[PDB]
Amino acid sequence: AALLQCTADTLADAVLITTAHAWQHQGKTLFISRKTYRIDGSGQMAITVDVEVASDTPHPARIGLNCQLAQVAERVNWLGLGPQENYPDRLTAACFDRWDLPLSDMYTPYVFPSENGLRCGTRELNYGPHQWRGDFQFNISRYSQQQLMETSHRHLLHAEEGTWLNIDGFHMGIGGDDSWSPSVSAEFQLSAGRYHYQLVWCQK
Amino acid sequence: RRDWENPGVTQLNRLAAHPPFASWRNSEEARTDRPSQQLRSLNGEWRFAWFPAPEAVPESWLECDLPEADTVVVPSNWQMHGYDAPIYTNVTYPITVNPPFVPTENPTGCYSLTFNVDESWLQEGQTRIIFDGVNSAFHLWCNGRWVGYGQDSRLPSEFDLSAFLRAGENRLAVMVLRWSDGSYLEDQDMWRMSGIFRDVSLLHKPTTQISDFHVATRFNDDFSRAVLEAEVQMCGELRDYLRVTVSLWQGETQVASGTAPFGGEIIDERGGYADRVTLRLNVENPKLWSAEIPNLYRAVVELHTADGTLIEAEACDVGFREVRIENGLLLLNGKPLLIRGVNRHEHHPLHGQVMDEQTMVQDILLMKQNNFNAVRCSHYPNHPLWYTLCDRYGLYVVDEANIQTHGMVPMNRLTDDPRWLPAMSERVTRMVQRDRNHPSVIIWSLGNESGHGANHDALYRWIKSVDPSRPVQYEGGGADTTATDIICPMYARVDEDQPFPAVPKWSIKKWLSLPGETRPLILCEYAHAMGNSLGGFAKYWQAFRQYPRLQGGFVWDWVDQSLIKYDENGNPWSAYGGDFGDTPNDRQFCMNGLVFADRTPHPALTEAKHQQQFFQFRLSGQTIEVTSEYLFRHSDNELLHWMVALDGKPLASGEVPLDVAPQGKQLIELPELPQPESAGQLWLTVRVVQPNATAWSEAGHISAWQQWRLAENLSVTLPAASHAIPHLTTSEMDFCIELGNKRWQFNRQSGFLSQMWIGDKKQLLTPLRDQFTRAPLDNDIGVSEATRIDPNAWVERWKAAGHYQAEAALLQCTADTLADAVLITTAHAWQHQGKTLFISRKTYRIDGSGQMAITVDVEVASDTPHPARIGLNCQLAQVAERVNWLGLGPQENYPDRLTAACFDRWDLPLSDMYTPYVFPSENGLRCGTRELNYGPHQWRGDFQFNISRYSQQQLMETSHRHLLHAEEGTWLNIDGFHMGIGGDDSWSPSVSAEFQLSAGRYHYQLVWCQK
Ligand SMILES: [Mg+2]
Ligand SMILES: [Mg+2]
Ligand SMILES: [Mg+2]
Ligand code: NA
Ligand code: NA
Ligand code: NA
Ligand code: NA
Ligand code: NA
């Protein structure tokens, strides 16, 4: 990530932070992310994200944000598709409703660790004192994408400190027509070039 | 006798049908197809009197000319001379449905001609009269004496006048009836016209004459050998000294000849035909006929004596080709066809249903130039010259019998009735007898929309028996009946089933593989081109190319059926059904053409051209793969031009000759392209250019094109920090932003940008507001009317939801000052009677560079019908001459009709940004636009736009294009998103789900600045 812009403006009833980043590899700009964070007097932080994706780079796996929360809470509560893991090209079985599960249920123990436990079409997510609202896909677990990527077997995984949260405006299909050639259909690839999502982060 | 109310009487004293005759008395004239003195045209000035009924015709008209009669040009339709109103109706009959009876008020056209006949014509031989087209029925008199009667408006009626004519002055009297029992088989959806609308001629033959001839061409397995078989029939006295010679010519070279006396082979217990002979000519390595290469020979049939004296000669153009269906594929010369077809009615805006060579040639040229290879004679045999031209220019023809009974309840009432079999048989049999020698005819059709009856099955088998060289098709009764060799639906969709009872229209892909089904599928009608249409056209062609047994179709249709009317100042305007005082009518449903009546193209024609391309392209790295879709011809008149541009700025270009075999491939390696200095998207454009002129095109003709995105460099470089700081001024009614000379005014009561100034110059006439509606397209409306509402039609769903009446309620309007900018935040709710339809949330950011960044985020209630568009609109004060944009163009393009459009820098006059559809609607949109320039203004983003002197409101409220008036300034519509136009048909919703605005939440952003 290369920082292009980071400004702060004090408004009548809010503070507005504006940022711009470029992700580059060997001279090539892959992605540009432009954001505003508006924190108002009600204590809510509205995050607006606008992403550019180079048309000649391979379509990305996801367009989102991630962080490691210090909190480890017992339950995960959301208003979206569930209760089980669902992805854009595998979500017909899932139902839109209010779901409440133990954190461990938000992780799928695939023998070969990978991205897992996504829930799509989520309008509200609750974890400990935090609430995220918008229209997003998320997963939440004690395992980072890095660890999942670097660990060969599920039994070798160790719970990390706190909780890793991945919130996606957009997520690529998983495919599966076969498992030896690209099988994600065009309509589930992230090929639009420009992507927009908005999130509100507040305390319960 | 009232023969015009009797299906048992279709003719009286009519001669047999036959291929085109000229009775040359010189063989060389027959070879070269020069005019014949034995075939005399009676076209020109005739006398005409209109009557309300045949009973109203005075008995003196048979012998003497009427003083009340006017002089008119023949051929003509008498409605085009203003004698009565041309009635237009779709499904319903224009008369009372009571077969076989017609109205007592039956408009009667009394034609007459006084002409000279030379004694030499009457001293020997036979003089016949030929009426190529009389609508719908007629009685004939010659010198006061009754000659005969004829029906079928679309085939020649011929009568022997040898005993009726006298040396010197002769008078013909033709009583033409608008309505007859023949009308029940002539219920086509078009203008109901009448009169002598095709040629009238006299033909002199000797008494010993060629009465018929049939030409067949058969081939060996690889088409390297052929046998031409010519059956010749005679009339007159049989003599042993009589001979027939058939000679075959390739240009001026005679390739084969055969001579024989009369007397065919034994066929039964009674012997054979003494008045017939069959000649068989061997042809080695024949040059084959196709639409790609219309190679023709000339066959000359000589009737003569053994000592060498010619009696007469007839002749025809011969195309060596084989049409067969094998293993479910329609094949021509062993190769599977892909039909790039169109339906073509015979229509001229000035002459009605009268056809001329100039118009026919104009149509064929435009068709071939737009990659059509096929034409369906909807829905009747055509003027005889049409087939000659298709033979010579190369178009595949579906010849169709003049049988349509669409108004019957049920549709097969007459066609399943054995009492109507005689009349139906004549329409099929007489077409085959006339047109069977034309190579351009590859498929016979039994008619149109007449259900499926036993009469169809009988006539299907008749054709199969007499002419096995051509498949038979027929759509009626579900498109896949026992009376068709080809599954030939009308408006069956690509992926979507329409499971109507008894006659379902399956998805064409699904239809092929139904249990037991093996036949090819070629749509007799598809892609209804009514108004702003042809949305989803690319979906058909992708399917056609992927599925072997999907072999194309015929677009509905070629030409708008509008006629010319004049106002007070004598200025012409295009009129449809209902403008001529005819009621009940079917409004603008006569205008479904790819071209206007004057043959000016609609925007949809370019989409057709692109999808029907004969070359296919793929790109892999630096390699362009070109695939030929030609079946027979090498690419011997083709050059590939390639261009690489960065956001419209050309960086590299070149040309490479194409040398591709039919069905072959060519790989073209592009040279090392230098990496651009600037940020932006590189685009590759290729086009196939024809360097040499042809019979159908000019030098430089572009036949194919394609585009790809190459490398993109995203802009990361921060622009030089602007020194100027915009200032906010607040009043109770307005937020005002100032930057030097420039001013932006936001109205606080409405929440919209109401005005902009540069110095003292106002920029807006109407504020910038959200827009969620469009002036409804013909496809949006369907068959919905004010008296007969179709609640399923898109326009009615939008109306009932309050979309057009939606009023903006302000929720939020704030102003913030940033370090180097002013931020305006707004929120509006669009509500109809308590219901929130849409919410629009916006920010306007104006910085020291004078750029106004607009961000728009829209919520659409999930239970409201999906909106026509999600955009902004305003009336600009400026009227500028030019429109300049970086985006898809140059022509009008919509989300489901933008494949033909290319991404480049385009610059057109403002008037070219409006499409003059006869029925005004949303028009002129250009999609995928990143920059738009108009006068002092520049807009940047990723949007769809149209720009014109007409508001959406005026387009929607005005019935005809000629009633439109340029409004003050310029109406700009900038859409983040726009709904598809559809067009699979124009009587039910046809916008595919992927082109409907159903996402619920939408985001777009624009930048507005001075240029
Ligand atoms: Mg579902
Ligand atoms: Mg009759
Ligand atoms: Mg394309
Ligand atoms: Na792993
Ligand atoms: Na095909
Ligand atoms: Na029509
Ligand atoms: Na060439
Ligand atoms: Na209108």
Residues 6+ apart with CB under 8 A from B771: B869, B871, B872, B873, B952, B973, B975
The rounded distance, in Å, linking the Cα atoms of B681 and A39 is 36
Q: With the CA atoms of A167, A168, A172 and A176 taken in that order, what torsion angle do they form, in degrees rounded to the nearest 10?
A: 30
Query: Which stretches of B608-760 are assigned E, i.e. beta strand?
Result: 615-620, 623-628, 639-646, 649-657, 665-669, 680-690, 701-713, 727-730, 734-739, 742-747, 753-758
Search chain B and give the residue with CA nearest A30.
Answer: B714
The rounded distance, in Å, linking the Cα atoms of B134 and B139 is 10
Q: Where are the domains of chain B?
A: 1-206, 207-321, 322-612, 613-718, 719-1011
Partners of B445 in the β-ladder: B400, B473
Q: Which two tokens stand for residue B863?
A: 């239970």
> Residue B961, Cα to own-chain centre: how many angstroms?
21
Amino acid at A78: W
The rounded distance, in Å, linking the Cα atoms of B862 and A94 is 19
Cβ pair B819:A194 closer than 8 A: no
Q: Which two tokens stand for residue B1004?
A: 């777009």
Give me the residue label for tokens 């009023």: B807
> Which CATH number is correct for B613-718, 2.40.50.100, 1.10.760.10, 3.40.50.150, 2.60.40.10?
2.60.40.10
SS3 state of residue B563: strand
A180 is in an annotated binding site: yes
* Order of strands, sheet of B615-620, starting from the edge strand that comes earlier in the sequence: B615-620, B623-628, B665-669
**C-alpha distance across the termini of chain B, in Å:** 81
The rounded distance, in Å, linking the Cα atoms of B81 and B70 is 11
User: Chain B contact for A27, CB < 8 A?
Assistant: no
Residue whose C-alpha is closest to residue B211's, from B252, B160, B150: B160
Cβ pair B1005:A50 closer than 8 A: yes
Partners of B929 in the β-ladder: B943
Query: Taking a C-beta distance cutoff of 8 angstroms, is the pair B577, B356 a contact?
Result: no
Resolution rounded to one decimal, in angstroms = 2.0
Q: With the CA atoms of A106, A112, A113 and A117 taken in that order, what torsion angle do they form, in degrees rounded to the nearest 10?
A: -30
Query: Taking a C-beta distance cutoff of 8 angstroms, is the pair B188, B347 a contact?
Result: no
The rounded distance, in Å, linking the Cα atoms of B126 and B204 is 6
User: How close, in Å, is residue B712 to chain A by CA atoms?
Assistant: 6
- 3-class SS shares of chain B: helix, strand, coil, % to 5: 15, 40, 45
Q: What is the CA radius of gyration of chain B?
A: 33
User: Chain B contact for A52, CB < 8 A?
Assistant: yes
| Per-residue b or e along B264-293, where b marks 16 or more CB atoms closer than 10 Å to that residue's CB | beeeeeeeebebbbbbebebeebebbbbbe
Q: H/E/C letters for each residue in B31-62? A: HHCCCCCCEEECCEEEEEEEECCHHHCCHHHH
SS3 state of residue B775: coil
Amino acid at A194: R
List Cα–Cα distances, B333 to B220, B268, B398, B995, in angstroms. 11, 34, 17, 41
Q: Which CATH architecture has domain B1-206?
A: Sandwich (2.60)
Cβ pair A32:B714 closer than 8 A: yes
* Order of strands, sheet of B44-51, starting from the edge strand that comes earlier in the sequence: B11-12, B145-151, B137-142, B168-177, B108-117, B44-51, B70-74
The rounded distance, in Å, linking the Cα atoms of A86 and A96 is 12
User: How close, in Å, is residue A13 to chain B by CA atoms?
Assistant: 10
Measured in Å, residue B263 CA sits from the centre of ligand 2 at 38
Angle at B8 between CA B2 and CA B9, to 5 degrees: 50
The rounded distance, in Å, linking the Cα atoms of B92 and B784 is 16
The rounded distance, in Å, linking the Cα atoms of B108 and B106 is 6
Query: Which stretches of B179-290 are assigned E, i.e. beta strand?
Result: 191-192, 195-196, 200-205, 209-219, 225-235, 242-250, 253-260, 276-284
Q: What is the CA radius of gyration of chain A?
A: 18
User: Chain A contact for B718, CB < 8 A?
Assistant: yes
Partners of B243 in the β-ladder: B304
SS3 state of residue B81: coil
B525 is a catalytic site residue: yes
Give me the residue label for tokens 């590859």: B442
Which residues in chain A have their CB less than 8 angstroms from residue B1003's CB?
A: 196
The rounded distance, in Å, linking the Cα atoms of B777 and B782 is 9
The rounded distance, in Å, linking the Cα atoms of A61 and B1001 is 22
Prior bond of B467 cis (ω within 30°) = no
The catalytic residue among B449, B607, B922, B931 is: B449
Residue whose C-alpha is closest to residue B100's, from B75, B137, B143: B137
Q: With the CA atoms of B188, B191, B193 and B198 taken in that order, what torsion angle do they form, in degrees rounded to the nearest 10?
A: -70
Amino acid at B757: W
**C-alpha distance across the termini of chain A, in Å:** 32
Which residues in chain B have their CB less than 8 angstroms from residue A52's CB?
A: 714
Which residues in chain A have their CB less than 8 angstroms from residue B714's CB?
A: 22, 29, 32, 52, 54
Residues 6+ apart with CB under 8 A from B764: B753, B754, B755, B756, B874, B875, B876, B877
From B713, B816, B942, residue closest to A12, measured CB to CB? B816
CA atoms within 13 A on the CB side of A123: 8
User: Chain A contact for B857, CB < 8 A?
Assistant: yes
SS3 state of residue B392: helix
Q: Exposure of B598 by Cβ count < 10 A (0-12 exposed, 13-18 middle, 19+ buried)? A: middle
Dmax of chain B from CA atoms? 113
* Order of strands, sheet of B276-284, starting from the edge strand that comes earlier in the sequence: B209-219, B225-235, B276-284
CA atoms within 13 A on the CB side of B17: 20
Cβ pair A29:B709 closer than 8 A: no
The rounded distance, in Å, linking the Cα atoms of B217 and B286 is 10
DSSP letter for B954, please.
H
The catalytic residue among B346, B525, B607, B638 is: B525
DSSP letter for B91, please.
S
The rounded distance, in Å, linking the Cα atoms of B260 and B385 is 31
Question: Breaks in chain B at C–N > 2.5 Å: after which residues?
Answer: none
CATH 3.90.79.10 for domain B207-321, yes or no, is no
Query: Taking a C-beta distance cutoff of 8 angstroms, is the pair B641, B689 a contact?
Result: yes
> Residue B658, Cα to own-chain centre: how many angstroms?
31
Q: Which two tokens stand for residue B572?
A: 């012409």
Angle at B186 between CA B182 and CA B189, to 5 degrees: 155
Measured in Å, residue B865 CA sits from the centre of ligand 6 at 28
Query: Taking a C-beta distance cutoff of 8 angstroms, is the pair B263, B295 a contact?
Result: no
Number of H helices, E strands in chain B: 12, 58
The rounded distance, in Å, linking the Cα atoms of B600 and B593 is 10
Residue whose C-alpha is closest to residue B488's, from B410, B398, B426: B398
Measured in Å, residue B520 CA sits from the centre of ligand 5 at 9
Partners of B305 in the β-ladder: B242
Q: Which two tokens stand for residue B212?
A: 């018929």
Q: H/E/C letters for each residue in A169-196? A: EEECCCCCCCCCCCCCCHHHCCCCCEEE
Angle at B829 between CA B823 and CA B830, to 5 degrees: 130
Report the CATH number of the B322-612 domain.
3.20.20.80
From A4, A9, A55, residue closest to B716, measured CB to CB? A4
* Order of strands, sheet of B157-160, starting from the edge strand that comes earlier in the sequence: B39-41, B200-205, B126-131, B157-160
Measured in Å, residue B65 CA sits from the centre of ligand 4 at 102
Partners of B214 in the β-ladder: B231
Query: Which stretches of chain A are assigned E, i.e. beta strand?
Result: 2-10, 14-25, 28-40, 45-53, 62-69, 75-82, 95-102, 119-127, 130-141, 163-171, 194-203
Same fold, B1-206 and B719-1011: no
Which residues in chain B have their CB less than 8 angstroms from residue A32's CB?
A: 714, 716
Helix ranges restricted to H, B719-862: 778-781, 794-801
User: Chain A contact for B714, CB < 8 A?
Assistant: yes
Residues 6+ apart with CB under 8 A from B625: B617, B618, B619, B665, B666, B667, B668
Q: With the CA atoms of B506, B509, B510 and B512 taken in that order, what torsion angle do they form, in degrees rounded to the nearest 10?
A: 100
Strands B297-305 and B310-318: antiparallel
Query: Taking a C-beta distance cutoff of 8 angstroms, is the pair B421, B10 a contact?
Result: no
Helix ranges restricted to H, B677-788: 778-781
Cβ pair A12:B1003 closer than 8 A: no
Q: How many CB pairs under 8 A join A and B?
A: 38
DSSP assignments along B526-542, one per residue: ES---SS--TTHHHHHH
User: Chain B contact for A185, CB < 8 A?
Assistant: no
The rounded distance, in Å, linking the Cα atoms of B450 and B184 is 10
CA atoms within 13 A on the CB side of A160: 17
CATH 3.20.20.70 for domain A1-204, yes or no, is no
Residue whose C-alpha is closest to residue B283's, from B298, B293, B270: B298
Q: How many CB atoms lie within 10 A of CB B819?
A: 11
Q: Which two tokens stand for residue B287?
A: 């040059």
Q: Which two tokens stand for residue B160?
A: 């022997």
User: Chain B contact for A178, CB < 8 A?
Assistant: no
Residue whose C-alpha is closest to residue B90's, from B460, B349, B406: B406
Which residues in chain A have their CB less than 8 angstroms from residue B825's CB?
A: none
Method: X-ray
The rounded distance, in Å, linking the Cα atoms of B948 and B925 is 10
SS3 state of residue B345: coil
Angle at B820 between CA B815 and CA B821, to 5 degrees: 30
Which residues in chain A have their CB less than 8 angstroms from residue B710's CB?
A: 56
User: How close, in Å, is residue A23 to chain B by CA atoms?
Assistant: 10
Angle at A139 between CA A135 and CA A144, to 5 degrees: 140
The rounded distance, in Å, linking the Cα atoms of B980 and B985 is 14
Residues 6+ apart with CB under 8 A from B692: B637, B699
Q: Which two tokens stand for residue B950?
A: 């007409």
Report the CATH number of the B719-1011 domain.
2.70.98.10
Residue whose C-alpha is closest to residue B133's, from B188, B95, B205, B77: B77
List Cα–Cα distances, A160 to A70, A85, A110, A112, A142, in angstroms. 10, 21, 18, 18, 5
Give me the residue label for tokens 């995984």: A157
Phi, psi dihedral angles at A51 (to 5 degrees): -115, 135
Give me the residue label for tokens 């001579």: B259
The rounded distance, in Å, linking the Cα atoms of B304 and B300 is 12
Dmax of chain A from CA atoms? 57
Residues 6+ apart with CB under 8 A from B975: B771, B869, B870, B871, B872, B925, B943, B944, B945
Cβ pair A12:B818 closer than 8 A: no
List Cα–Cα distances, B316 to B54, B203, B321, B891, in angstroms. 41, 17, 15, 43
DSSP letter for A16, please.
E
